[PDB]
Structure formats: C-alpha cells, structure tokens
Write a protein that binds this DNA or RNA. Structure first.
Ligand code: MG
Ligand code: MG
Ligand code: MG
Ligand code: MG
Ligand code: MG
Ligand code: MG
Ligand code: MG
Ligand code: MG
Ligand code: MG
Ligand code: MG
Ligand code: MG
Ligand code: MG
Ligand code: MG
Ligand code: MG
Ligand code: MG
Ligand code: MG
Ligand code: MG
Ligand code: MG
Ligand code: MG
Ligand code: MG
Ligand code: MG
Ligand code: MG
Ligand code: MG
Ligand code: MG
Ligand code: MG
Ligand code: MG
Ligand code: MG
Ligand code: MG
Ligand code: MG
Ligand code: MG
Ligand code: MG
Ligand code: MG
Ligand code: MG
Ligand code: MG
Lengths: 92, 93
RNA sequence: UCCAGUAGGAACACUAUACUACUGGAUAAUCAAAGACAAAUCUGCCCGAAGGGCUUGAGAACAUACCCAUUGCACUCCGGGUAUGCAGAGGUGGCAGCCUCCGGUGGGUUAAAACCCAACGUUCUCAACAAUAGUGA
RNA sequence: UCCAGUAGGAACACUAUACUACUGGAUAAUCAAAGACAAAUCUGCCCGAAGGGCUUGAGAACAUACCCAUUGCACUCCGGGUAUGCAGAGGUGGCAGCCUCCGGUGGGUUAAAACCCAACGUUCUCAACAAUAGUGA
C-alpha cells in the first residue's frame, strides 16, 4: 500500500552520491514537496535510493508517471517503501 | 529533419532474437496506426537497429514522439525519422 | 657525479653551509622558464604543565579513476583489488566563525581585461628528524 | 578381440554374409533397456539424356550458448573468436503447397488420459563409397 517514501533501484551505480542526489530531486520535485532523499553507495545500498515526499499522493503520482524513466541511461524501478521512514514515524 | 512513414530506431538490446524483437516492436507500436512492415537485421552493421513502416505519415510522427526514450528490453529507445523513403513506399506512391 | 637559477632549509629571527625538490645545462656548465608564508596578527567558546613544524616515513581514513563481485528495503559511517594523491597558505593548541592571500572552476561586468560575486581545495594516528657554523636579543 | 539384443546394411525389392552404430555382457557371453521408412504413393510449375542414397569424411553456411568488437540508415545475404549439432521421415529430379508419421515444445479438452489445434525440427559443396551370394519382380 502507498507510502510517503518511494524505493528506487536499478540505478547507475557508477554515479557519484552528490550528483545522484541533486539529479533525483530535480526530476521528482515536480511531484510535490520532498523532505529528504536517502542515498548510500554501500555494498548493500548502491544502485538504490529512497525519496521522501511530504504528501502520500505525491509519492503515488511520482511512482506512476516516472516508473521506467531512463535515469542516467537506466530504467528506474520505483516501488513503495515497505516501512515508514524515521523522519515520518517521528513526525506523526 | 522532416517526417517520414518509416522511423529509425537504435540503441536496441542487441542480445534479443530477430523473431522476438519483431513481434515485440509491432506490439508496442501498433497502437499508433497501421504497420506495413518492420525491418530488422542482426548484421554487423544493422544490429541494435530497426525500421518501422507505418501506412500514414502522422502515425510515425505520433509514434516517434510518445515513444521516444521508451524502456524497450531494458534500453531507452532512440527514435528518429528515416533519412530516405522505404522501397515498399517508393514503389507505391 | 658536478654547475646555475628558483623554492625550501623542518621547536625564536636573519646569514652562510649541509641538505631536499623543480627546471635547464657539462666545467666556460649558456640564455631561460617557473613561482602562494604578501598584508595583517581577528571574534567566540573550550582544553592544557607548556600553545608558533614549507622534513621524512609507517599505518588509517577520504577523494578520483578503472577492475572483480553486487538488483541490493534502508534511515550509524563502513565488500575486495591495482593506480593516483607530494597546493593549499597566514591569523601561536582544539572546534566554530570572520579576514586576507594562492589556486582551478561557475557566474556578473567589459570591446577585451581588470573589478566584483560565490562555492570549493587531503585529513587523522604513530614514529623518526627538526643539524652545524656565524650573528641577534 | 569375441557374444547377444536392436537398428542399419548405402543406385528397384526381400533375404544371408561382410560391415557401421547403440545397449549390455566374457565363451554358457545372462536377464534387459532401447526404438520414427507405419499408412500412403498427392496438387501445381520448371528442368532432364536417364528422375528412387537410413554410407563415411572434410570444408562451408546456419542456427543455439558464451567471449571480444560495434550506437550502426537500411530493404538478396552476410565481422571476428569458442563449444555444442551425429532426428527428422515417407510421398522417384528442382521449387512451391499439401497429406501422413516421428520428436519435443505451446495451447485446448479430461477427474487423468486418449484424442484435437498450432508453429516448429540442419542445410549446401566436394571427395570417397554404394560390395558378395541367393530369390524376386
Ligand atoms: Mg543522504
Ligand atoms: Mg637559495
Ligand atoms: Mg631538509
Ligand atoms: Mg636534470
Ligand atoms: Mg619571506
Ligand atoms: Mg609576513
Ligand atoms: Mg610557521
Ligand atoms: Mg606550516
Ligand atoms: Mg603520509
Ligand atoms: Mg527483489
Ligand atoms: Mg532484506
Ligand atoms: Mg574500495
Ligand atoms: Mg597509496
Ligand atoms: Mg590535491
Ligand atoms: Mg596554526
Ligand atoms: Mg586562537
Ligand atoms: Mg581556525
Ligand atoms: Mg579567486
Ligand atoms: Mg557585452
Ligand atoms: Mg578555504
Ligand atoms: Mg633549527
Ligand atoms: Mg540384424
Ligand atoms: Mg556399411
Ligand atoms: Mg561395447
Ligand atoms: Mg511402407
Ligand atoms: Mg534403396
Ligand atoms: Mg539438431
Ligand atoms: Mg526424395
Ligand atoms: Mg515430382
Ligand atoms: Mg517437397
Ligand atoms: Mg505432433
Ligand atoms: Mg490438419
Ligand atoms: Mg514438417
Ligand atoms: Mg546394392
């Protein structure tokens, strides 16, 4: 079921953390407010990213019209996060 | 570059069999109009590429526009207009 | 191995020497390029018995490049591997800030420059070395 | 090396030798598994002087899988490597349909099946070989 935070993978792992951050925010901002967007290049967290919207509908609208988007020459795979983010759990 | 019945596509997943590529392409482009034929070769020079021929010029335009970048077989499509008319069309009108 | 130019020459300051680096040269060692400790000595909080490193090395981290793995649901940084790092500087120790210089970017301005604006720049731990001569207080 | 079972034994057809392959066995050579040329002798067009290959090997092409190349404007076809291919068959030459049989795959049906439907299946060139005997027509 829907969730403020969307989970993205299949991301071009060769992209620097900094760039990936701003690039993601750039293409998702048009969908609403973005509290934060977590990105790690660990062995376990690379090629992945968590985007946090302030509204649940924003995430839904983003998951739908952006699914498959050719991000850095790779089709995005957006899903809902299986659990709420800390920023949101400790907010409401 | 001006419109053309036939659209040129490249950056296609070269690992895909000729047969599959054929039907898969027709499957996603049919919604844009009639398709006379769709040429696909796996030569050294023609692989990763495909030519789709519509019966209407507008069909090709509508297809080039709303399909550009489409994640086909895990690869962004690169649709352009064919630089020259196809034989099927030249020998038709 | 020598010679010169330039920078440095490491716990106060200058000079000379040893010596290190860069550049070019062959006893006459060319001519030259090149280059940041210039100015000034800041505010706040904190620690110490005492605040001042243009040395080298060994670890560690970090950054950048490729290579091998990895399709991975997290919210504390954190797989492995080769190569690279030798530009940042002054303001007396640490953190924060502010000022100035240097640098290569990105803007603004110009005919073009200046001039301005902004962000950014390898750090920690350990170990060795920080010499000699002269002068200065 | 022998023995058996099975298939084959290559230019009409049986059969028996030689011989090839698969499977299992040791002179008594086990028991067994396994397996498609069964039915039928089709419709066009074209070629010939005469239409009938379950043989072997090599090469080439092609498919599949992997590896390096390649972002590439075509409309007969096509870069390299590397490993597999030993199942397709009958309907008298070539081509095109069609029919049936094998095979696996996909789909429908059924409680399961049987059985239906569908698309599929290694080709070409060269070289060698297509033997004895018997009975046939
Ligand atoms: Mg982050
Ligand atoms: Mg000097
Ligand atoms: Mg020294
Ligand atoms: Mg030299
Ligand atoms: Mg000085
Ligand atoms: Mg000074
Ligand atoms: Mg100093
Ligand atoms: Mg210093
Ligand atoms: Mg070091
Ligand atoms: Mg998954
Ligand atoms: Mg998990
Ligand atoms: Mg690493
Ligand atoms: Mg190193
Ligand atoms: Mg540096
Ligand atoms: Mg200091
Ligand atoms: Mg101070
Ligand atoms: Mg400071
Ligand atoms: Mg500057
Ligand atoms: Mg102007
Ligand atoms: Mg700075
Ligand atoms: Mg000294
Ligand atoms: Mg026999
Ligand atoms: Mg034989
Ligand atoms: Mg044997
Ligand atoms: Mg028969
Ligand atoms: Mg015969
Ligand atoms: Mg086969
Ligand atoms: Mg025949
Ligand atoms: Mg015939
Ligand atoms: Mg035939
Ligand atoms: Mg069948
Ligand atoms: Mg039938
Ligand atoms: Mg068949
Ligand atoms: Mg014979």
């Amino acid at each position: 079921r829907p969730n403020h935070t969307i989970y993205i993978n299949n991301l071009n792992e060769k992209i620097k953390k900094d760039e990936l951050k701003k690039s993601l925010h750039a293409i998702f901002s048009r969908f609403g407010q973005i509290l934060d967007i977590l990105v790690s290049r660990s062995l376990k967290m690379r090629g992945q990213a968590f985007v946090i919207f302030k509204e649940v509908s924003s995430a839904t609208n983003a998951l739908r019209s952006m699914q498959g988007f050719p991000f850095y020459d790779k089709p995005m795979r957006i899903q809902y996060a299986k659990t709420d983010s800390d920023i949101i759990a400790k907010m409401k």
